[PDB]
Amino acid sequence: HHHDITKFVVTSREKALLYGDYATYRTQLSGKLLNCRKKLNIATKNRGKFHPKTAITPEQIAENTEYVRLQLLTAERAWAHAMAMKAAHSANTKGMTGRTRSHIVSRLEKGARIAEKLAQALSDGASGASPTDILDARAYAALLRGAALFEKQNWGACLKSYAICRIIYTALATSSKGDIFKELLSDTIDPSMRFAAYQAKIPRTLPIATIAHRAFEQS
Template sequence: MDITTFVIKHRDDALLVGDYNTYRTQLSRQLLAIRKRLSRSTPKTAKYTTKDAITAEQLGQNHEFAHLILLTAERAWAHAMRMKSTHAEDSTGQAISRSIRNHIVSRLNKAAKSAEELVTLLRDQTVTKASDIDVLEARAYLASITGAEEFEKQAEGQRSADAKASKHRWQKCLRGYSEARVIYAALLKETKKDVFREILANTVDPTIRYAAYQAHLPRTIAIATISKKNFPREDPWLVAAVERLDPDALRDEITPTPGKSWASLLSNSG
C-alpha cells in the first residue's frame, strides 16, 4: 500500500507550492473526489447522514478506502499545523493561548483516531490482504500523530526544574515517537527507502531529542537507546513484526566499561 510514501508525497507536493492551509484545501477536494468514487458522498440536495464505518472487506477490495482514511487524518493534521505555523509567524512574541493550544490538540486527536481506525482494519490481514510492512507503516504513522498530540499538550511550558515531574509529563510523547522511530528504522533497514531516512532525520529524531531534554534525560544517551527503552513491548505482534525486519531493532547496545575494549567484550560474549 506504500502508506508512508502516499502521505509524504501528498505533504511535499502541497507544501512545495503553498502552506498548510493550501494542503488542507487540497485535501478537502481530494476527499470529496474519493467519496464520490466510493459512493460515500452526500448529494447537494440531500440531507447529511452519517456514513457506515469502513470495513476490512472494503479495504481489501479497494485501497482507496485506505486513502480515504489517511487523507481524513492528514486534513486534521494539516489544520493543526496551520494553526501552529500561523502563531510562529506572529511577530508579537506572545505564547499560544490556551484555547488555540486546545484546538491544535483536538485536531491532532482527530487525526490520531482516523489513523487508529486504519491500523485496526489492517490488522485483519487475511481479509485486507495487508502485509506486515503495511501494518507497521500504519502503526508508525499513528505513533507519530499521537506523539505530536502529546508534544503539543506539554510544549506550552518552560523546562521544569523538577526532573521527576518532567519525565512523567513527557513520557507519552517519548513513547509515541519512540515507537515510530523503531519501526521506521527497521523499515529503512529492510527496504532502503529514502522516505524513512528523511522522516527519521527531519521529524522523529529531533523531536525525541527535544522531548528527552525536557524529560531531563542525559544528552549522552543516544536517540536509538532512548527509543528502544520507551518502545511499547507489551504488544507481542508488534515486537515480533519489527524483529522480523531487523533482529537487532530492540536489542540493547553493548556499552564498554572502563578498562575493557570492544574486542574483549565481544570475545567474552562468545
C-alpha cells in the same frame, strides 16, 4: 497491491509544501477528499443517515483500496489544520492562547484516532494487507499520536509513541534505504524526540563521559 501509507502521506505533504504551506495542503486535501468520497459513492453532504458514517472495516479495505485513501486524506487534513494554526502563531506561544493550543491538539488527536483505527483494521482481519503494510500503518499511527502529545506538552507519553514509530521506521528505512523513511526519521521523529527528551529530563543521569569524550573530540 501495496498500500504504501507513509509514502502516500509524505508525498502529499511534499506536494503541497513545494509552492505552498499548510494552508495550501489543507485546501488540496479537501478537494481530494471530496473526489474520493464520490468514487466510493459515499455522501458528500451527510443527509441519508442509514448508517454511522466513517467506521472502517477489513473487508472494505480488501474490497477497495480507496477506503484506505479516504482515511489518510481524512487524517492528513486534521494534521494540516493543526499545522496551519501552529504556523500562524510561529512567534512564541505567548502569542498563542491556551485555547488555540486546545484546538490544535483536538485536530491531531482526531487524526491519531483515524490513523489508529486504520492500522487496527489493516492488521488483524485478513484485510489482505502485507505485514510491511501493517507495520507501516502502525508507525504512521504512532507518528500522529506522537505529534498530538508533543503539542499537548505531555512529554513522557509522547516519547512512548515516537519510540514505537522510530523503531518501526528505522527498520522500514533500512529495508528500502528509506530515502523517504530516513528523511522522515531525520527531519521529524529524531528532532521531536530530542526535544521531548530534553523537556522530560530523560535520561535522569547526565551522560558525562559521553559528553567529556565528544566535547574534547572537536579539539
